[PDB]
Point group: D2
Chain length 283, copies 4
C-alpha cells in the first residue's frame, strides 16, 4: 500500500489520506509536535513521493486531506482524554451529510419531528438543507466501562490504520440514541479561518440552534439546558471572532429568550495540550 | 488614463475597473452580446495590455472586478428599463457594508430599532454582522419625474465614466427615506454560483428576512407585505436551487407564519433581455 | 314521577329539570312559541306546584334549570336540523368539566399534549383550569347515516324523557375521535347576558383559542383552519358585543398571525327559526 | 351631612360611602378590630339609620360600598406603612376604567404602544377591553421626601373625609410617570371570593401579563424584571387558590419563557397587621 496513487487524470495522483497519515505519524512524537508542523510536515512527505514517481497532486486533494488530518489529530486525542479521564461525555467524529444526518443521533421520536418539518416544507416548496458539525459531544451515562474496554487500544503511540477507521466509525454506536439532553454540544474545526470558513461556521451554528429550538417547541421542554456550538483552528485572531460570535439568526425575531451566539466559544488547537484544555473546559 | 496601473508589488498591476469597463464597452454592442462574452472579452482586453507593458494581474483583482462589471451591466440596464417604463420602483445599486449599512435606507425611526438591537446584543457579548445585498428595489412613489430628468443621459449607447459613477452613487438619494413598505425586495448577483457563493446568498437572504421580521415586531405591523430576496447569475442549474431555496432560518422556530425561503426566486441573467424579463417579473 | 321533590331543607323543594321540561313541553307548540315564553311559562308551571304542595323553590335551582332548559331547547332543534339536512357537522351538547374534559373529544395523541402541559405546569406550581363550552360542532365525515338511524326518533313533537337523555349523552359517541380539523367550533349559550356572563364567555373563548394554538404548535400545523367560538342568548344588545368581541388574550403577544376575537360571532336565539339561521350560518 | 340620602326611588336610600366610613370609623380602634368586623359593624350602623328614617337600602349599594370600605381600609394602612417606613415603593389606589386607564401611569411613549394596539385591532374589528387592578405598587425613586411631607397627616387615628379624598386621588401624581420597571406589581382585593370574583381576578391577572409582554416586545427589553399580580380577601381557602393560580393565558402559547401564573400570590387581609405582612413581603 502506497501513500499516493494515480487518479488516471494524466500526471494526476490522489492521496491515500489514512495511509499517509499513519505512515508519517508513526515517525513523529505527536506530544511534542504542534499540529501545524505535522500538517506541513505531512504535505512535504507526500510531495517527495509525487516527485520520485513523477506526478502531480492538486491543492484540492491537499485541502480535502488537511481537514481529515486536522480532525484525526483532534479526534484521537479526544479518545485518549476519554480513556485517561472519568467524564460522562465522549467526543465523537461525524461523517458528511452526503451519507449521514447528525439528527439521527437523537432517538427516533425526536428526529421524526425534523423529518416531519422537512416534508411539510417540501410541500410548500421550501428545502431544509442541513450540515453535520465535525464532532458531537455525547452524554454516555452508563456505558463508560463498555466504551473504555472497546476503545482501549486507541492512541497516537500505537497508531495504526485501524485506529483511523475506529475514530471514523465510532458514531455508529450512537444512532437512535440521544434524548434532547444527551447531546451537549457540537464542535466544528478548520486548519485556519478565511472569510468563507467563518461564514460556514456561523451559518451552521445558527442552524443547529434553530433546529434545537424547533425540538424544544415540539416537546414543550421548558427551560432546557440548550446546546452549545464551538469552533477551533490552529490559530485564531480577533478578526475571526467578529464574524463567528454574531447572533444566532432566530434570536433576532424573539425577545422572549436570552440572545444566543451562533458560535459560543472559539478555541485555538495547535497541540495535544490544547485539545485537553479545550475539552476540560467544554465538559 | 490607462486601463491598468502598477500596484508597486513588483510586476503587479491593478485593474482600473471603471476605465477598463468603459473603454472596452464603447467597442461592443451590449444589446447583441451576452454578458458572459463581455466579461471574458473584458478579461482578454486587460491581458493584452498587461503583456504589452510586461506585467502581472492576479485573478483576485480579476475576480473582484468580474463582480463589478457584472453588476454595472445589470445596474445600467435597470436604469434604462426605468427610463423606458412607467414603474414606481427603481433598482438601486448598494455599496459594501464596509462603508454603508443598507438599513439606513429606511427612515431613521425604523433603522434606530436595528441600532438599538445591535447595542443591546453587544452588551450581552453578541455581535450583529450584516451584509448589504447588491441591489434594493425601492418604491419611488411621487419622484418618478424628478429621477427621470436626473437620469436622462444614462445608457450603454452613450457609455461614459460618469455613467458608472452615477450607477454607483444613486443610492445617496435614498438615505433615511423608506417606510417598511417602500423597500420591495433585494437582489444579489454572482457571475456564477459555487458552493461558497450559494452559502453567502442563503445566509444573507435569511438574515434580511430575520431583520425584516424584527422590524415588523417593533412596529407591530399586522399582515405586512413582506420582502423578497432574489438571486441571479449568468448561468443557473438545478444543483444551485437546492441550496438557495432552503428555509429562512427564523421560520424553523415559528409555526405562526407561512414558511419563507431564504431566496424566493433565482434568475438567469446573461443579457439585456434577461434583465428586462427578470425586472418585469419582479416589479 | 313529580316535577318537584322536597330537598329535605325544610320547606325546600328541588326541581326535577327533565320531567318538568318534558311535562310542560308536551303541552305547547315549540315551533310557534319563542324560547323566552317557554322558560317563563316553565317557571310558572313549577310555581303552581310548589304552591299546591306548600313549598319553596329558590331562584338558584331556577337559575340552574333555566340554563338546562335553554340548552335542551337548542340541542333538540340542532338534532332535528341534522336529521332534516345533509350536513357533515353535528352540534353536540357537552357535560360539565366537573365530570368531563372536552379535550378528550380529540384523538388521544392530541389530548395527551394538553395532559403533558398540565403536568409540566403543576411541577412549576401553576394550574391549568379549563371549562367546557356548551356545544361542540363536530365533523362527522362518514358516519352521517349511522347517526341519522340512531337519532331518528328525536323531536319536539315526540318529546320524551329519553329524548333529553340522548341529547345529554350523545357526546359519548365522540370520545378519542377528533383530529385537529374535526372540531369546527364551540358554542356557549346564556338565557341573557349580564356582566359576569359576558366575562365567562370572553375568558373561555380566549382559553379555547390558546389551547388550540398550543396544539397547532405541538403538531407543527402550518396554516390550519382554526377554531371559532360563538355565543348566543335569547336577546343580545350592542352593549354585550363590546365585551364579547375583545381580543383573544394570546394575540396581544404575537404579531405573526391575524388578531383573533375571543368570541367570533354572537347570535340571538329565541326560537327554532333562530336556531336554523344560526346553524346554517355556522356550518 | 348625613350618612344616607333618599335616591328618590320611593323608599330607596343611597349610602354616602365616605361620610358613613368616616363617621363610623371615628368610633372604633382600627388597630384592634379586624376588617370583617368593621364592615359588618358598618352595615349595621347604616341599617339603624335607614330604620329611624324609615327607608330601604338595597344590598347592591351595600355590595358596591363594601368594596369601597375594604379598599380604603387597605389603602390608608398602606400609606401609614409608607410614612412609617423607608421603602421606595408606594401602594396607590386606582380609579375605575370607566374614567381612567391604568396604562397612562406609564410614560407616554409606552402607553402609546397600547393605544396603537387598540387602534389596529379596532380596524380588524376586534376590541381591547382592559380593567384597572385596585392598587398599583409604584417605584418612587427620588420623591420619597416630597410624598412623606405631602401625606404627613394621613392616618386612621386622625381619620377625616379629606383623608378618603387623598387616598382616592393620590394616583394623579403618577400620570405619564412610569418607565417599564417602575410599576412593580398590581394588587386586586375582594371582601370574599366567590366563583365570579375568582374569575375576574384570573382574567385581569392574565390580561396585565399579556399587555406587559406586549410592551416588553415593542421596546425589545431582554430579560426584564416582569410584573406580579396579587390578590387578597378577608378570608382565603384552598378552593380559592385552584382557580386563581391558573396559568396566564399567553404562556400556553409560548415555550420560550417560564410559565407564569395569572395570580402570583394570594393574601389574607383581615387586619392592619395583615396589611403590613403582605406589604413587607411584596416590597
Amino acid at each position: 500500500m502506497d501513500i499516493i496513487s494515480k487518479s488516471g487524470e494524466g500526471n494526476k495522483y490522489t492521496i491515500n489520506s489514512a495511509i499517509a497519515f499513519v505512515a508519517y505519524a508513526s515517525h513523529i512524537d505527536i506530544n511534542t509536535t504542534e499540529f501545524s508542523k505535522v500538517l506541513s510536515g505531512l504535505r512535504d512527505f507526500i510531495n517527495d513521493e509525487a516527485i520520485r514517481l513523477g506526478g502531480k497532486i492538486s491543492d484540492g486533494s491537499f485541502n480535502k486531506c488537511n481537514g481529515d488530518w486536522y480532525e484525526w489529530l483532534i479526534g484521537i486525542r479526544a479518545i485518549e482524554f476519554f480513556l485517561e479521564s472519568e467524564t460522562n461525555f465522549i467526543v465523537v467524529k461525524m461523517p458528511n451529510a452526503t451519507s449521514f444526518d447528525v439528527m439521527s443521533i437523537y432517538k427516533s421520536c425526536l428526529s421524526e419531528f425534523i423529518y416531519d418539518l422537512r416534508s411539510k416544507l417540501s410541500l410548500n416548496n421550501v428545502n431544509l438543507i442541513t450540515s453535520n458539525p465535525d464532532f458531537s459531544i455525547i452524554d454516555i451515562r452508563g456505558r463508560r466501562e463498555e466504551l473504555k474496554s472497546m476503545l482501549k487500544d486507541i492512541s497516537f503511540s500505537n497508531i495504526s490504520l485501524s485506529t483511523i477507521s475506529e475514530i471514523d466509525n465510532l458514531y455508529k454506536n450512537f444512532i437512535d440514541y440521544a434524548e434532547l439532553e444527551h447531546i451537549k454540544s457540537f464542535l466544528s474545526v478548520k486548519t485556519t479561518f478565511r472569510p468563507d470558513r467563518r461564514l460556514q461556521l456561523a451559518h451552521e451554528g445558527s442552524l443547529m440552534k434553530a433546529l434545537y429550538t424547533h425540538l424544544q417547541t415540539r416537546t414543550w421542554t421548558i427551560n432546557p439546558t440548550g446546546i452549545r456550538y464551538y469552533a477551533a483552528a490552529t490559530s485564531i485572531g480577533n478578526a475571526d471572532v467578529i464574524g463567528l460570535k454574531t447572533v444566532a439568526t432566530h434570536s433576532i425575531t424573539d425577545v422572549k429568550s436570552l440572545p444566543q451566539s451562533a458560535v459560543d466559544e472559539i478555541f485555538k488547537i495547535n497541540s495535544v495540550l490544547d485539545v485537553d484544555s479545550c475539552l476540560s473546559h467544554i465538559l
